[PDB]
């Protein structure tokens, strides 16, 4: 009822905005409004406090390990990107390189499958993709594109199962544009504008790549959500062809328009569902063939992040809770409680090996009060 966490980490002295986890080591990085990133372990109670990264000029808003596990990439709201090289089996993380090419970074992601690669987008609309040198960790710019005319709100890599030379990225902007890039050449593969979405204003803020098994082999289907309730599902391998476009909620006159804002999108291959989470608290589960709502949840305040995992849909909320629903039946299986302010981000950890009988997944949060909580969740 009050705090059902397993353990906690509370060294930040301001809101925790971002949380990331090493691909193979039991290592968390969190980034905060105290302009610091902290490194700590995910497999012990209490966590081991590994250490602290410094050098930021503002709040840390991304903490991303590279897919092969050699590097950690962090970004802040003053436009800095720092790259740290793992040392001593991952116990220490040493500054290798950094840059400050923009006024403010909105998002940064490492590539999920291609080593030593990341991209970021900025408030001036610009899009950047870099690699990290394997020998000295130096920054290698692949592209820098200035096409979006307002904040580049989000990016998502596509075609990630095609090898190390297929490096493609979709980005979106508050100016209603969506662009796909070949990151190695910097070329714009396609651009969706307002004129191609029925003339509608759609300040995009969320992107999520579909699982290939849901799309008959297509590794470039992306769902896009705007801050005014527009949902677009696009085929990035057919020039951005629109597979679906709809307004997902009709607000009452009294409601702030931001109530329709689509903050997070997640796909389930098993259930052929796509879930979207709104500022008004609605979580809408769409069938991915007919693009109709099949089920919905209603939280008492804004959704901050959604994540399908097996049968479950996990949903963090600005009321400080993380909900665990059975996606098909709707059962509230668990509620992670303990935060006294909102949950701003979270990660989900699986036991690495199927032992001989089943250990629990962990939800690890980033809290607005400066705390991360570790929860063991059912299944």
């Amino acid at each position: 009822m009050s705090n059902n966490s397993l353990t906690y980490f509370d060294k930040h002295t301001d809101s925790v905005f971002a949380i990331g986890h090493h691909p193979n080591l039991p290592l968390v990085c969190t980034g905060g409004g105290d302009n610091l990133a902290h490194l700590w372990t995910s497999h012990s109670q209490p966590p081991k406090f590994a250490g602290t990264l410094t050098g930021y000029g503002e709040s840390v808003i991304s903490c991303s390990f590279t897919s092969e596990g050699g590097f950690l990439v962090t970004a802040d709201m003053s436009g800095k990107v720092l790259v740290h090289m793992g040392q001593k089996g991952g116990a220490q993380w040493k500054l290798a390189s950094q840059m400050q090419e923009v006024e403010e970074i909105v998002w940064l992601k490492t590539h999920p499958t291609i080593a030593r690669t990341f991209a970021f987008g900025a408030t001036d609309g610009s899009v950047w993709c870099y690699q990290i040198n394997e020998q000295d960790g130096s920054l290698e710019q692949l592209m820098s594109g200035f096409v979006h005319q307002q904040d580049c709100s989000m990016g998502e890599f596509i075609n990630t199962d095609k090898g190390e030379n297929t490096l493609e990225l979709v980005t979106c902007s508050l100016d209603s544009t969506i662009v796909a890039w070949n990151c190695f050449t910097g070329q714009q593969l396609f651009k969706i504008t307002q004129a191609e979405i029925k003339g509608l204003e759609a300040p995009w803020i969320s992107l999520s790549l579909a699982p290939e098994t849901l799309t008959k082999g297509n590794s470039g289907v992306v769902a896009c959500g705007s801050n005014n309730g527009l949902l677009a599902v696009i085929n990035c391998n057919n020039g951005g062809a629109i597979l679906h476009l709809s307004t997902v909620i009709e607000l009452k006159p009294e409601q702030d328009e931001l109530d329709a804002s689509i903050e997070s999108i997640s796909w389930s291959s098993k259930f052929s569902l796509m879930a979207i989470g709104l500022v008004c608290g609605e979580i809408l589960l769409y069938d991915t063939s007919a693009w109709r709502v099949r089920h919905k949840f209603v939280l008492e305040d804004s959704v901050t992040k959604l994540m399908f995992d097996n049968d479950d849909l996990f949903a963090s909320c600005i009321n400080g809770k993380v909900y665990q629903f059975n996606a098909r039946t709707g059962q509230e299986k668990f509620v992670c409680v303990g935060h006294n302010m909102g949950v701003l981000d979270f990660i989900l950890l699986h036991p690495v090996a199927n032992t001989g009988t089943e250990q629990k997944r962990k939800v690890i949060t980033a809290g607005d009060e400066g705390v991360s909580l570790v929860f063991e969740v059912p299944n």
Binding site: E58, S59, I61, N227, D256, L258, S302
Partner: peptide, 14 residues
């Protein structure tokens, strides 16, 4: 110490 734009959306821009 600044807060990213999504935080202001969660709060509907207090």
């Amino acid at each position: 110490a600044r807060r990213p734009a999504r935080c202001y959306r969660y709060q509907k821009n207090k």
